[PDB]
Symmetry: C3
Subunit: 343 residues, 3 copies
Amino acid sequence: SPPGTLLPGQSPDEAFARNSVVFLVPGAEYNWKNVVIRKPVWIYGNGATVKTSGLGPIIHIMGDLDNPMDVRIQDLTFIGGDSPDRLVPFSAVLTNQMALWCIDPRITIRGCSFYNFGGAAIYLERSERDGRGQVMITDCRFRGCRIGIANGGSVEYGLASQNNFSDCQICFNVVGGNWTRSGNVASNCRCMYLHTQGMWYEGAAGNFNPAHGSFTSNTLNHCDYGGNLWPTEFQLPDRVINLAGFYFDNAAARLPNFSGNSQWYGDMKLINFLPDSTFVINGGALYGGPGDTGVIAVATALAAKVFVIGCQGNAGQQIVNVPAANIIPEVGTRKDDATQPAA
Amino acid sequence: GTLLPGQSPDEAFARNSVVFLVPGAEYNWKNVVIRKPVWIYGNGATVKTSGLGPIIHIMGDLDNPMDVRIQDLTFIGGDSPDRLVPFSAVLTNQMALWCIDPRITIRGCSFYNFGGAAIYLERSERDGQVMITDCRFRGCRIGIANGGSVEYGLASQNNFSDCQICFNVVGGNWTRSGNVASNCRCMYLHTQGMWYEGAAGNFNPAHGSFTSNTLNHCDYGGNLWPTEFQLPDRVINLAGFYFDNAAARLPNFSGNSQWYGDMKLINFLPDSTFVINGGALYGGPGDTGVIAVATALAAKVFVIGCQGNAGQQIVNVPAANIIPEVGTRKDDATQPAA
Amino acid sequence: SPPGTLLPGQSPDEAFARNSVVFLVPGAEYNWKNVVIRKPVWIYGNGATVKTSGLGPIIHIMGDLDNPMDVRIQDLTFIGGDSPDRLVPFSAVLTNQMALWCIDPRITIRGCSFYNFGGAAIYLERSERDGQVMITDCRFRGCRIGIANGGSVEYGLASQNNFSDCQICFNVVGGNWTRSGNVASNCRCMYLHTQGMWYEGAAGNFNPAHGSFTSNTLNHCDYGGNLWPTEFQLPDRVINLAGFYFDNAAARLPNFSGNSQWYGDMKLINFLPDSTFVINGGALYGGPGDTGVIAVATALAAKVFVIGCQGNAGQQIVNVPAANIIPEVGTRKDDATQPAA
Ligand code: MMC
Ligand code: MMC
Ligand code: MMC
Ligand code: MMC
Ligand code: MMC
Ligand code: MMC
Ligand code: MMC
Ligand code: MMC
Ligand code: MMC
Ligand code: MMC
Ligand SMILES: [Cl-]
Ligand SMILES: [Cl-]
Ligand SMILES: [Cl-]
Ligand SMILES: [Cl-]
Ligand SMILES: [Cl-]
Ligand SMILES: [Cl-]
Ligand SMILES: [Cl-]
Ligand SMILES: [Cl-]
Ligand SMILES: [Cl-]
Ligand SMILES: [Cl-]
Ligand SMILES: [Cl-]
Ligand SMILES: [Cl-]
Ligand SMILES: [Cl-]
Ligand SMILES: [Cl-]
């Protein structure tokens, strides 16, 4: 192997430690487990596939926020197992079933695919509370994963755009604040966006300065009806929750900006958020029914702070607890029901 | 993995999972067939062709997890186009890529002077992720044609210029975001009885997402393609955005710029509303960049959070449906014409 | 040296003039100054780094708008110096401290990084008034200006880029660009357009701005992170920068939708009267004090709308009439001393 090439069966750790850039064998099958990257390196995957066994992650990446060079991973497929067991309860042990675990990340992940991870396919965390460590995840595919992307507290200002999710329970497990998530396509996932207190994958910085990012031009279809196979019921560290397409429950956090999103048979649960704010579902397409499929529900206590502006939709779409004066133009069927949203 | 000019592409694709072209070289291909996933690193090469297209036929395997991927490759379909020739079934073959049952990624490629659709995607049967990003389309009759049941694709950050129709839309649920189009007659077309519906037909159509796009100089100040356009069974008069299908819903439409970029909302499924949200609507003088809705459906259309000038005409949408006021509101039941 | 490879220490000018596509040595360190590209060429940077010295640009690119092939630069890091001197007054001298100076560009810049440029990291100009431009997935850090597009450099796309610790991200003259999905933090100004700018180029301040500005984030511009000064020297006067600064009676504002402004002040000083402007679908968070103020000139206030925006009580909206703000967001205020140029 000339310098820069990493063959199947060779030691990845040694290759990464000795090279600033590494090229994999085009279309080859690798088998990696707990590989450790301690310095910036670029990996050109060249259409290769990385399988694994046992307890993940496939790669541990120890970031150096001081170093101007980023870790970059392009054009690589990661396989976490065979098609998932969706009925297994989630637990601390399964949080290890990751493709990438990055701490203090300065990373670019572009054109990669992630199949059948029992935890988060990608997990980013910060070793200490503070965003000069820029994170970019674009043009990736996620299929069969429990969680797509988990960003811990103080992993901030990342960009996750133009990704495609299908058959995942939770696409974005959101803790760290200020991310832009734009132009992502999701279908047959229980939940595109989850934020609450007491989450998995908060990391060492904890649930700090959370969410309040940007969520634009995304599609979240068939969350609760007409495609998704993952259960609604989901085990957090201290309690069970009932997932929705968009789930937000944290009295100490603000919601992201929410504009240009399509929700066909979604459901959205705005359970709790910081009272010194408003929230607008802006420029959305809201399609649902018949029955309670693709419901948007807000806590009555906060309903007056929620608006639905410039949205299109059908009569079958239910909007729950938002005052009629707050919905311009009329869209869907407006309803009052203080039992909704349930946590 | 290297494929040289003059070698057989079919053999190279059938024998390799990944193929690298000679950087900057000129290839000459015609009716190449790909039957298994393969990645092509184009490396700035150019592919010319002759006769009847496509340049490449791609027979997809939806069962197979690997995608076909094509990067950094320029496709040339001919010399600068004959814009006055009537469109016909024969010209539908003048394609760069024809993909069936696609699981495909097309990134950083350029498509010049195709007499049909530069890219055509179809499904062999009614119900495979599709990504088309950072591509350039210039001089093509049609940019991207997605047939019925080719759904949930992403076409973003592409640039279209001097094309008659950028997106020939049949298949549903695509995201089309951040595309820049100038001097094209039509950015988006959906109707019944289209070209390139493919085997699944006009099924579960449109109702996708159309955000942050720019469609400029469609009917004035740049475009050279004719308005009049031949579908299989009738002639239509194109607009920057043309929608006529009583059995389909419109996409979400937010953050788009329309400078001299006419829109015709002729017909759509009555159990829906439509909003032109967060747009910039600039037009006039005269009837340039008109937004027109059928009077029968006008009450279901809203123009919300849009900016624009006095010269921009908005036709048949009720005044109560336009917040804030933008342009010059007008009633005219002869608009929009098919 | 096989065809298409350019090694450190070899002449870049000769390599570019002899090849249509060039591959750099993966992860190698190059040192270039005033390299000249006269014909389309693609550069695969392969994670290499380019340092420089003296007066920039690192690369001069003389475009041929007649030629269908683009210049393409991928996966390359450009270093303009050590961490910047933010208190130095800006002057004509420093405008040369660029990574890329392109004239009559047909160019794609993808996956590149730009560190510590004393001028514009990227400057695009047109040699004559009336060529597709794409700048995506790039990082800009410590630069005075990120991207400067001169007059008649139009219809470019700048999307999915990340800016931090820059004074001005986009120095906007040329019209009709789409700027979408960009993330900026700790920069004094994300968008600047006015008369009498730096980097107007040979075509001047012609057919300016009026593009598209969507899904961007501009955070901590005037508070809580940014270290660059507000006060900024243009050729003929000093201005006081804001996160979004627009002052040109002869130009229209871009479409403005889906943007987040946390401590991200906006000054709409002057713009063409035959238009309206809408802050659509935004998140507007500010306070306490005058941090993240949105201010419009009282003369033009009636033409400005704030539609479908969310925010907090601390966010100040100045001079926009109450009837123009739907739904209510922030604290509405009248003050004709704002915005100051
Ligand atoms: C971070 Hg292992
Ligand atoms: C970190 Hg602003
Ligand atoms: C995808 Hg919900
Ligand atoms: C089928 Hg939406
Ligand atoms: C599908 Hg050829
Ligand atoms: C391009 Hg209309
Ligand atoms: C030129 Hg708008
Ligand atoms: C173009 Hg120097
Ligand atoms: C970044 Hg203001
Ligand atoms: C702190 Hg935003
Ligand atoms: Cl660790
Ligand atoms: Cl679905
Ligand atoms: Cl967020
Ligand atoms: Cl191979
Ligand atoms: Cl065929
Ligand atoms: Cl034009
Ligand atoms: Cl659509
Ligand atoms: Cl009004
Ligand atoms: Cl070469
Ligand atoms: Cl020059
Ligand atoms: Cl976008
Ligand atoms: Cl602009
Ligand atoms: Cl938007
Ligand atoms: Cl004034």
